[PDB]
Design a protein around this ligand. Structure first.
Ligand SMILES: [Mg+2]
Ligand SMILES: [Zn+2]
Lengths: 718, 1316
RNA sequence: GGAGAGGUA
């Protein structure tokens, strides 16, 4: 009665049931502000009952609790106005069942609705990871006063915009508003009313609504940007841009201080996310939230106007698919014939078949995409021209609403090679997309693949839950509990290299972590930053332009505070743009942030320098061989290719006894093979010239005279 | 060619493959297994007879007497089905067996009879099976799913190098009996051989060898070849076997026949063996050094001293050779050993064996099996004998023997049900052989190794394990003396058998409640093939290899239909055509392909026999002769696919749709979707709530009628005839002349079940689908059940859908629903709830149901009559009184809050010895009257039928039509007639009439007795009153309706019709889905279905317009014919010229709502014919039309897609989910709010939510949320007081649950307390 | 109150 999930500790002692609660299904209702949610009448009148009693007795409509309970029970029409009176400014908490990260439980204001389903603002669905296909959500009410204020000032939805895992915004317009905006900011080469000139955005809006000009056609319009490059002073500057009426209409929504070029491109999903991020980082918070709401409204409206539907004619099969597949078939047949006669071995036949099938698949995919993304050829009032296609599926895929290019490949081109259960790859791919029909066997194989995927997701989530529960129970007791430990040890933050390109630059690894020892610009003895400053965006720019290479940064692994870590050692809160407040639980948020993505994971020669720049070697103990090259006699020798600036750009691991064309501090041409070695066998490399004497090398009991037989030179094996 | 009743609505059919084997009865595996369970089988190998003949006879220990079995019998069920469902008692049947006790004479020799006595002892109650295939246990009809457990026999399994970290595999061999103790042989990393019994401690196998009385030399002679050494004048000339030299080198100079065959240090080539055999060498001189590392075969003794020079199985030494030569042992036998051919795996185990004789080995076994309990001389031998070789405790079934002999390359497929020395020896031989390289391990997912065990077999085995107990009891009883006065009644006890069967049927892991909210749900639940249960594998600790789909599943178990979530791949469903073999494996049909002709004869193949032949799959083009038009035909040879010649094939599949289950065979355009999305589509198709009036699906897969009529809901005729009188409740058919028996003329009569609750509270009723004068034929459909339409399944409604985003109201997956969908009332569903109220017999006396209750106004009592029970038909609402009960010192039943509806039926049961109040008497009298009237009506129906028959036979040979009518019917049946068989028929009919009169006059009495009697009841209850509410759940924002392609969504708003998009004709659409959902979730089936439905409704609309204005048949005939044409060589070929020129009119009438279209799953209609059909109507061939917005009135650019789609309303309403709680009850042990909606419980602030709140800075809210809102009793009372007084604060205190933990942990020896 | 089965996210 103590152990296990059924024991007291994990059942009735850490998480209890609770009064004042409710549960329901959720629908969308996109007319809500960002800081409120719908609430059914019945749930509202059942949750808040004690407050209704209080108001009734205060107002003298029931001089006891029994009469008041009767009045509530049969709800005379008076109680509804009282209920609305109680709700005025009383937040509630909405929660979803598998609440992984800190954003899973959020506050809201309630708005009474004559329905039976909790309406939820459509932007926060991303934070909840809440599809509307039947998900249920639970409602709690905070009773005391301090609870109400805590809800309002910590969990009200307009205070959680940046995810604690990383600064990235978490209310990115998700999947439909993005399609609307992308279809809004485009340009057909020749649409209705092309070339005229307008006197500002609202004029363009009126023109479009009157129907004289299509939603996207090139047009010169005069716009007045605002720039606050001064000391917090907005300066208005007008100009005559050349854009499309869609973009001009959209500009009417954005707040004051943003450059116009931010709403000039095609506005995919990534562009919208970046736009929100810049708006937040320039104009505080309130403008950002109001702007996000307006973005959602306009996006929905113009997407609805678009009528972007999907049809079976909008899945174009490239005209060369059959020829490609037939040629690949003949290519397979020739190798099959080769192995019939024994000219080749089974393994090589198999590998060649797989390789050529992969080549055919890639060719088909490329041909399909090329015929799909530019098929539009339309005259430009002259003879002919081509532009980005309006094919519906492509318009949905490119914008980023739904589905990568892989799904388009599976819908139009052949759907690749399918793998049998035990990890092997079937030598015969599926040569049929979904616009055409799969026959029996192909469908069978696809079925196996899908079932493997499903079972893997089930087991993977089951395990990830245990992982996160373990993690949060080793870091739960850590709480930033000082202001400054007063130390100097940190760690050397540098961009990460894997042999190839930079997988992560420096500006995204030290963004928001205090420095340990003031960096010296590469004008050495030029103090660029103080030693205990927060490296926010401006200092990051200063580092970037001066091409800083490696920075000493105070890290939470060496802070000297006891029973907690000091404020500076941690860095920036990362969920709101300022240093961490004293007295904050960071261990729990760290554990949850590492455990949340746990379900998106999967369960089961010669150096070719590719950039012009100087070459430097670390830990070189080398000599010059007979060919004049450089032969290394150390193991930890590492080569760095540095650009003209003096900042490292590439790294490579040099095996022992590897010959190098260059020496040290030379210049390498792009694509130059700079070194080579024999990774197969190990030599007995010497150091200097002379005679080589076999000491203590006696045939018969110490070695064997295994003289070479195919050639006949001297050979003896220890 | 077309039946009359089949011309009401001919479903236009696509498809090209001619079906060659129509689908079989869909419930064979239940109605046949249980049919074999209870039958007089003289062969004595199926069902009960086998069990009885297996346990009996029983011989006493002396044995001066024995008890032997004779025969059995099943009585008449006490209650028929309807009564059993009403009351709640098992629909069972008594089981009477005629045992027979025989008494010998002690002094006379063994075998003699003093006197023998027998009687018919009662024992047990075996539940019976309704017609459909569902048992009734306690008014809660359940179904038993089949099991998929690993078959008895032998398996040579292996581990894939997941032990010893050495990369060395370890083969093991298991013998699995059908009932008894298992057996295992395993290889230790050191190449030993270990036996293991029932997963107890290990043992060297040589001991179990010795158990069978085997000597060391015997074992060695069994398991090895013998090399012979000849002590001669010259150092061991040795007799050589040529095969030895293969794969080995020479350590010395093999030189014989005066020729150096080879020198030392050289590997021996096949050329060396070839030259040796050419020279025909038999003996070679071998240096003594070769025998250095050898081991003797049999013990060698010194002749003179009689001592043992060298015991068997030991190495050789030079001094041992000297002693041999001194003793003159010419012939020396030694082992044949090699590191790859013959590993000496036995000798090492011999060495490990600490035992040498039979007694010690038996003692070792006895000690291992029973720790402690010092063994005796007889204990070990008795244990072994009755463990592995007594037919009463170890039994390989017939299937076991068959599989066993098939796995050892034997010839006989029948033998003994026990083991024998040769069996164990052969298993060891085969295991060693596998270790040496020949042979192959066996995988376990092969469908040739897993057995289907349907309901009959499991119930029979439970019955046998019941019988064993009474057998033991009677054996120990007869062991006693005093047999002169026994009877076979006191020793036989009915409680054990009844318990052993009832517990299985009523509460097991394979007798589960039958969800019944469809025909499809029933059908697909009776065919389920589970892998869990007793003897199977656990749900939560099953690996991954089990869940995957094996290549052998093709055509036996559906691969796409499976309940996702915690248990994938353990609840797979049976495929459409799959049969069950004789033993129990799964078979599938194929068409025999002769030399070059695809014939029509079909063979059913098993899972193993498929692995040998070559099968060309279903869709291979052939032209009227069985010749494959192409010459490189696709085939599945053996666990893989390839292309083969036109002559190498040996079998071809039956139909395209033998791969999928029945549940997933109803999806049109199945071949276009993904896999997992079709999976969700099926699993949601299973949950469609029946609607108020069903509607056919515009685009089906032709597999509807089979599911409709092969389930039980529709009332399918049994003998074709003419409808005589239809009605809302019953039907009468005058049977045709041919299909009538000579006597007992009669006329068929059907009764229809009106509104009665299903198991999920969805009303099921039947409506007639015929009218007066309509002919009908055998097997035709007469009464449509829930969600059926002219006898073809119809779960949901087909509605006009347009794909386009609409002001975000369909953001993620939501659905925008126009208001016509609810105005026309075409989704409302009727639900029926049963509410009970019991009158317990408690302290302070009992309590009653008097209509008077305290402190309530007469207003709430207006709906109760004088007795205290609501009237039939009162329209109650939320919070009312249905029956008024009294607190003995107000426990009156009340309607659950939120539900409305009308009371439609009331029942009351009273325990014997209690006077029955007014309402009960009223209901009893009403039932009496109803039964009498019903019986009278049916009697006169049959009597009129009989007299019509008599008039028919009188007018043949002596008709006087006038005379018959003059004298009334009462005196017809003795009129004169010429002498022939006609007089015989007249006499037979008169006899039948009298018999019918007697039958009725006694059946009325039987029904009276059944009604007026008392009622059995549970102890403590005096009377129970049940009331049925009927509700009409209409539709709300929040319900969850879904398509057939797994595109579920939560309806989100009910727009007024004037706001919905409308095309230029003026017809506003009725749904607005979200286009964004297609590309990411690849299921194009929905879009293709939308286009096809659009074409179908276009044709329907054209016909409707043609009929609106009066158009003579001349035009309808033409147009309908041309419509049924226009395929790509379809197989339909329906000819309108043969219709009666009035069936054409009725066909047009039934087609005016759209021409139904068929599309077999994997042989469907391609794009081209869809385009052609669309162009047949005047619709735009592109499929997309141009709409107009409702509010603005301006046009949408980008023409959108609109068509007709079939949608179902799933059984996840909103009003069964929405819930709230402010202050309710409280648990008992730990003061926390209760849980669940049944009780008025609150939600659970789970652990992860506590973490989340800690992640914020929020501390006060968390502290209150787990101190004052749930647990701290004084805290929450004061909180309530403060809140009422309008002063928000709290008084935290300490949780009560913590005190519970403190006391509980202090209940151990631990002293834990709180310090200062 | 506890078990068993099925279902939803
Ligand atoms: Mg969901
Ligand atoms: Zn610190």
């Amino acid at each position: 009665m103590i152990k296990g999930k059924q024991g007291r500790f994990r059942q009735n002692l850490l998480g209890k049931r609770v009064d004042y609660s409710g549960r329901s299904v959720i629908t969308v209702g996109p007319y809500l502000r960002l800081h409120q949610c719908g609430l059914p009448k019945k749930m509202a009148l059942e949750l808040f009952k004690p407050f209704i009693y209080g108001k009734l007795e205060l107002r003298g409509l029931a001089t006891t609790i029994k009469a008041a309970k009767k009045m509530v029970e049969r709800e005379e029409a008076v109680v509804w106005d009282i209920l609305d009176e109680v709700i005025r400014e009383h937040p509630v908490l909405l929660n979803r069942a598998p609440t992984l990260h800190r954003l899973g439980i959020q506050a809201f204001e309630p708005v009474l609705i004559e329905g039976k389903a909790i309406q939820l603002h459509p932007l926060v669905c991303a934070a909840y990871n809440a599809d509307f296909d039947g998900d249920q959500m639970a409602v709690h009410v905070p009773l005391t006063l301090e609870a109400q204020l805590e809800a309002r000032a910590l969990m009200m939805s307009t205070n959680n915009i940046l995810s604690p895992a990383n600064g990235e915004p978490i209310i990115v317009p998700s999947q439909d508003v993005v399609l609307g905006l992308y279809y809004m900011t485009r340009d057909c080469v020749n649409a209705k009313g092309e070339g005229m000139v307008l006197t500002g955005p609202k004029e363009a809006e009126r023109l479009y609504r009157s129907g004289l000009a299509s939603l996207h056609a090139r047009v010169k319009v005069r716009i007045t940007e605002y720039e606050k490059d001064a000391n917090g002073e907005l300066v208005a500057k007008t100009s005559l841009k050349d854009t499309t009426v869609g973009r001009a209409i959209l500009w009417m929504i954005v707040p004051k201080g943003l450059p116009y070029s931010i709403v000039n491109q095609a506005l995919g999903k990534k562009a919208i996310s970046k736009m929100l991020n810049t708006c937040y980082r320039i104009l505080g918070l309130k403008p950002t939230v109001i702007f996000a709401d307006q973005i959602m409204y306009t996006g929905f409206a113009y997407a609805a106007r678009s009528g972007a539907s999907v049809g079976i004619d909008d899945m174009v099969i490239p005209e060369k698919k059959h020829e490609i597949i037939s040629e690949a078939e003949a290519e397979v047949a020739e190798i099959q014939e080769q192995f019939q006669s024994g000219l080749v071995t089974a393994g090589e036949r198999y590998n060649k078949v797989i390789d050529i099938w992969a080549a055919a698949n890639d060719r088909v995919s490329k041909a399909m995409m090329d015929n799909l993304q530019t098929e539009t050829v339309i005259n430009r009032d002259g003879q002919e021209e081509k532009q980005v296609s309006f094919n519906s599926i492509y318009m949905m895929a490119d914008s980023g609403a739904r589905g990568s290019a892989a799904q388009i490949r599976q819908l139009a081109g052949m759907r690749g090679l399918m793998a049998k259960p035990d990890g092997s790859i079937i030598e015969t791919p599926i040569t049929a997309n979904f616009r055409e029909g799969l026959n029996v066997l192909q469908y069978f194989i696809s079925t196996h693949g899908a079932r493997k995927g499903l079972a893997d997701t089930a087991l993977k989530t089951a395990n990830s839950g245990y992982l996160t529960r373990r993690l949060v129970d080793v870091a739960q007791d850590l709480v930033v509990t000082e202001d400054d430990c007063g130390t100097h040890e940190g760690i050397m933050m540098t961009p990460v290299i894997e042999g190839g390109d930079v997988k992560e630059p420096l500006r995204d690894r030290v963004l928001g972590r205090v420095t340990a020892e003031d960096v010296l610009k590469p004008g050495t003895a030029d103090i660029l930053v103080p030693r205990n400053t927060l490296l926010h965006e401006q200092w990051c720019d200063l580092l970037e332009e001066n091409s800083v290479d490696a920075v000493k940064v105070r890290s939470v692994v060496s802070c000297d505070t006891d029973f907690g870590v000091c404020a500076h050692c941690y860095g920036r809160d990362l969920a709101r743009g300022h240093i961490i407040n004293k007295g904050e639980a960071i261990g729990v948020i760290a554990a949850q942030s590492i455990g949340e993505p746990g379900t998106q994971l999967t369960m089961r020669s010669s150096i070719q320098v590719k950039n012009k720049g100087s070459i430097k070697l670390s830990n070189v103990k080398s000599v010059v061989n007979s060919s004049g090259k450089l032969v290394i006699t150390s193991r930890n020798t590492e080569l760095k290719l540095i650009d003209e600036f003096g900042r490292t750009k590439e790294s490579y691991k040099v095996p022992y006894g590897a010959v190098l064309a260059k020496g040290d501090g030379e210049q390498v041409a792009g694509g130059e093979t700079v070194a080579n070695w024999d990774p197969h066998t190990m030599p007995v490399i010497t150091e200097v010239s002379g005679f080589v004497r076999f000491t203590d090398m006696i045939d018969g009991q110490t070695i064997t005279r295994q003289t070479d037989e195919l050639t006949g030179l001297s050979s003896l094996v220890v | 060619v077309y039946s009359y009743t089949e011309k009401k609505r001919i479903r236009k059919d696509f498809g090209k493959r001619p079906q060659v084997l129509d689908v079989p009865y869909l419930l064979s595996i239940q109605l046949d297994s249980f049919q074999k369970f209870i039958e007089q089988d003289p062969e004595g190998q199926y069902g009960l007879e086998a069990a009885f003949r297996s346990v009996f006879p029983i011989q006493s220990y002396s044995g001066n007497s024995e008890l032997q079995y004779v025969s059995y019998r099943l009585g008449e069920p006490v209650f028929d089905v309807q009564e059993c469902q009403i009351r709640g008692v098992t629909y069972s049947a008594p089981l009477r067996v005629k045992l027979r006790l025989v008494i010998y004479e002690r002094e006379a020799p063994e075998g003699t009879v003093k006197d023998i006595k027998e009687q018919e002892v009662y024992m047990g109650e075996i539940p019976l099976m309704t017609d459909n295939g569902t048992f009734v246990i306690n008014g809660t009809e359940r179904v038993i799913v089949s099991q998929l457990h690993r078959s008895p026999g032998v398996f040579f399994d292996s581990d894939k190098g997941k032990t010893h970290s050495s990369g060395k595999v370890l083969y093991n061999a298991r013998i699995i009996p059908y009932r008894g103790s298992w057996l295992d042989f395993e290889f230790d990393p050191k190449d030993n051989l270990f036996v293991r019994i029932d997963r107890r401690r290990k043992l060297p196998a040589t001991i179990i060898l010795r158990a069978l009385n085997y000597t060391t030399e015997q074992i060695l002679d069994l398991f090895f070849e013998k090399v012979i050494f000849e002590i001669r004048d010259n150092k061991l000339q040795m007799e050589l076997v040529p095969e030895r030299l293969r794969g080995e080198t020479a350590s010395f100079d093999i030189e014989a026949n005066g020729k150096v065959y080879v020198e030392k240090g050289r590997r021996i080539t096949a050329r060396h063996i070839r030259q040796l055999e050419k020279d025909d060498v038999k003996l070679i001189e071998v240096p003594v050094e070769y025998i250095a590392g050898k081991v003797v075969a049999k013990d060698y003794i010194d002749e003179s001293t009689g001592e043992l020079i060298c015991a068997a199985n030991m190495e050789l030494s030079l001094d041992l050779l000297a002693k041999l030569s001194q003793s003159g042992h010419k012939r020396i036998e030694t082992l044949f050993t090699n590191d790859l051919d013959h590993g000496p795996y036995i000798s090492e185990t011999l060495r490990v064996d600490p035992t040498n004789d039979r007694l010690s080995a038996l003692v070792e076994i006895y000690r291992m099996m029973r720790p402690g309990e010092p063994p005796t001389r007889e204990a070990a031998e008795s244990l072994f004998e009755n463990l592995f070789f007594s037919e009463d405790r170890y039994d390989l079934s017939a299937v076991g023997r068959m599989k066993f002999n098939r796995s050892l390359l034997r010839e006989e497929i029948e033998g003994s049900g026990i083991l024998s020395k040769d069996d164990i020896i052969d298993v060891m031989k085969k295991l060693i052989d596998i270790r040496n390289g020949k042979g192959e391990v066996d995988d376990i997912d092969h469908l040739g190794n897993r057995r289907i065990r349907s309901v009959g077999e499991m119930a029979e085995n439970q019955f046998r394990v019941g019988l064993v107990r009474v057998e033991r009891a009677v054996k120990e009883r007869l062991s006693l003396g005093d047999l002169d006065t026994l009877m076979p009644q006191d020793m036989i006890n009915a409680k054990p058998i009844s318990a052993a069967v009832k517990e299985f049927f009523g509460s097991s892991q394979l007798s589960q409640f039958m969800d019944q909210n469809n025909p499809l749900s029933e059908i697909t639940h009776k065919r389920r093939i589970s892998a869990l249960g007793p003897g199977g594998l656990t749900r939560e600790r099953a690996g991954f290899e089990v869940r995957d789909v094996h290549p052998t599943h093709y055509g036996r178990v559906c691969p796409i239909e499976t309940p996702e979530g915690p248990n994938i791949g353990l609840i797979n469903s049976l495929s459409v055509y799959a049969q069950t073999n004789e033993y129990g494996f799964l078979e599938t049909p194929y068409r025999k392909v002769t030399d070059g002709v695809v014939t029509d004869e079909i063979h059913y193949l098993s899972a193993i026999e498929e692995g040998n032949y070559v099968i060309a799959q279903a869709n291979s083009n052939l032209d009227e002769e069985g010749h494959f038009v192409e010459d490189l035909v696709t085939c599945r040879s053996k666990g893989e696919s390839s292309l083969f010649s036109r002559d190498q094939v040996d079998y071809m599949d039956v139909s395209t749709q033998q791969v999928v289950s029945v549940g997933a065979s109803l999806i049109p355009f199945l071949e276009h979707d993904d896999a997992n999305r079709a999976l969700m589509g099926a699993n949601m198709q299973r949950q469609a709530v029946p609607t108020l009036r069903a509607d056919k699906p515009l685009v089906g897969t032709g597999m509807e009628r089979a599911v409709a009529v092969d389930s039980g809901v529709t009332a399918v005729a049994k003998r074709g005839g003419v409808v005589q009188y239809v009605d809302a409740s019953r039907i009468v058919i005058k049977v045709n002349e041919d299909e009538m028996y000579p006597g007992e003329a009669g006329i068929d009569i059907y009764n229809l079940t009106k509104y009665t609750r299903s198991n999920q509270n969805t009303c099921i009723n039947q409506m007639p689908c015929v009218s007066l004068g309509e002919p009908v034929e055998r097997g035709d459909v007469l009464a449509d059940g829930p969600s059926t339409d002219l006898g073809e399944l119809a779960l949901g409604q087909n509605m006009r859908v347009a794909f386009m985003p609409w002001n975000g109201y369909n953001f993620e997956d939501s659905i925008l629903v126009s208001e016509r969908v609810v105005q026309e009332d075409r989704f409302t569903t009727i639900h029926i709830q049963e509410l009970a109220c019991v009158s317990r017999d408690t302290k302070l006396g009992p309590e009653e149901i008097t209509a008077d209750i305290p402190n309530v106004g007469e207003a709430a009592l207006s709906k109760l009559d004088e007795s205290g029970i609501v009237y039939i038909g009162a329209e109650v609402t939320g919070g009312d009184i249905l029956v008024g009960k009294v607190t003995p010192k107000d426990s009156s039943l009340r309607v659950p809050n939120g539900v409305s509806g009308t009371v439609i039926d009331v029942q009351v049961f009273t325990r014997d010895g209690v006077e029955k109040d007014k309402r009960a008497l009223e209901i009893e009298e009403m039932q009496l009257k109803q039964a009498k009237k019903d019986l009278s009506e049916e009697l006169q129906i049959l009597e009129a039928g009989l007299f019509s028959r008599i008039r028919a036979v009188l007018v043949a040979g002596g008709v006087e039509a006038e005379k018959l009518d003059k004298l009334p019917r009462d005196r017809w049946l003795e009129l004169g007639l010429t002498d022939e068989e006609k007089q015989n028929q007249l006499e037979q009919l008169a006899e039948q009439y009298d018999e019918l009169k007697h039958e009725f006059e006694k059946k009325l009495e039987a029904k009276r007795r059944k009604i007026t009697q008392g009622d059995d009841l549970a102890p403590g209850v005096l009377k129970i009153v049940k009331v049925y509410l009927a509700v009409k759940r209409r539709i709300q924002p929040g319900d969850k309706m879904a398509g057939r392609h797994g595109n579920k969504g939560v309806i989100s708003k009910i727009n007024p019709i004037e706001d919905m998009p409308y095309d230029e004709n003026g017809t506003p659409v009725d749904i607005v889905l979200n286009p964004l959902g297609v590309p990411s979730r690849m299921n194009i089936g929905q879009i293709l279905e939308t286009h096809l439905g659009m074409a179908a409704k276009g044709i329907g609309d054209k016909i409707n317009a043609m009929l609106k204005q009066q158009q003579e048949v001349a035009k309808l005939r033409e147009f309908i014919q041309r419509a049924y044409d226009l395929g790509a060589d379809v197989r339909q070929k329906v000819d309108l010229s043969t219709f009666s020129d009035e069936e054409v009119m009725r066909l047009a009438e039934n087609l005016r709502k759209g021409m139904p279209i068929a599309t077999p799953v994997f042989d469907g209609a391609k794009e081209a014919e869809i385009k052609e059909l669309l162009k047949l109507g005047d619709l735009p061939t592109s499929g997309q039309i141009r709409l107009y917005d409702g509010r603005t009135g301006e046009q949408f650019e980008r023409p959108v897609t609109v068509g007709y789609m079939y949608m179902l309303k799933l059984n996840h309403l909103v009003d069964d989910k929405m819930h709230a709680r402010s202050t309710g009850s409280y648990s008992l042990v730990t003061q926390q709010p209760l849980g669940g909606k049944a009780q008025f419980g609150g939600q659970r602030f789970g652990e992860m939510e506590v973490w989340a709140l800690e992640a914020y800075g929020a501390a006060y809210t968390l502290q209150e949320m787990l101190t004052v809102k749930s647990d701290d009793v004084n805290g929450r009372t004061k909180m309530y007081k403060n809140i009422v007084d309008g002063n928000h604060q709290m008084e935290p205190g300490m949780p009560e649950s913590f005190n519970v933990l403190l006391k509980e942990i202090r209940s151990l020896g631990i002293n834990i307390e709180l310090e200062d």
